[PDB]
Symmetry: C8
Subunit: 30 residues, 8 copies
Amino acid sequence: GEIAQALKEIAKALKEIAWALKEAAQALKG
Amino acid sequence: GEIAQALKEIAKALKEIAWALKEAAQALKG
Amino acid sequence: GEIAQALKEIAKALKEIAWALKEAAQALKG
Amino acid sequence: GEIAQALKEIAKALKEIAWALKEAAQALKG
Amino acid sequence: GEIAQALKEIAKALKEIAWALKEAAQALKG
Amino acid sequence: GEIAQALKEIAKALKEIAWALKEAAQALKG
Amino acid sequence: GEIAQALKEIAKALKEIAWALKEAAQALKG
Amino acid sequence: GEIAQALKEIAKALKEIAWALKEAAQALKG
């Protein structure tokens, strides 16, 4: 369904936030 | 539908947050 | 509809968070 | 309606988060 | 209604996040 | 009801995020 | 119910974000 | 159900955000 589809797109975007934070953590290690 | 499209707009906005955090990560790199 | 309208206002606010984070990233570059 | 009005209150709160992050960005500027 | 009530409690908690970020911004000014 | 109670649990978790950010603000103060 | 169950899992994940931020605050104290 | 499963995917994504913030906390530790 389209509402479940759209909530799965929200989950994917949250995972992109997680990956960006991981990239931030690597920059702080530097 | 209207509600699924609005949820998809929320996902896109979350992706824009991820891109902004990547810009932050890059700024820390130096 | 008013619920879709309100979810689109949530998306707009999330984009304002993204823009604030971009401004933060520019400050870290400094 | 009650639920749309509550979702609009959530959007306003997210905007307050954006303003707070702008204050953070300004504090980093110096 | 109880669902609108609970969404207004979510808005209040988001405002508490905003206030904490403002306190963070003041600490960075220091 | 079950759903309102779960939304209230989400609000409480967001408040715990606010408290953690206050701890971060205090750590920056020195 | 499964939707209330899933919203309680979202609350638990938000508490894990709070705990991670507390760990961050301890690192800034250092 | 589809919607509960999508909400559970959102919880998992939030947990990935928590793990990324823990990586950030560790990077600050030194």
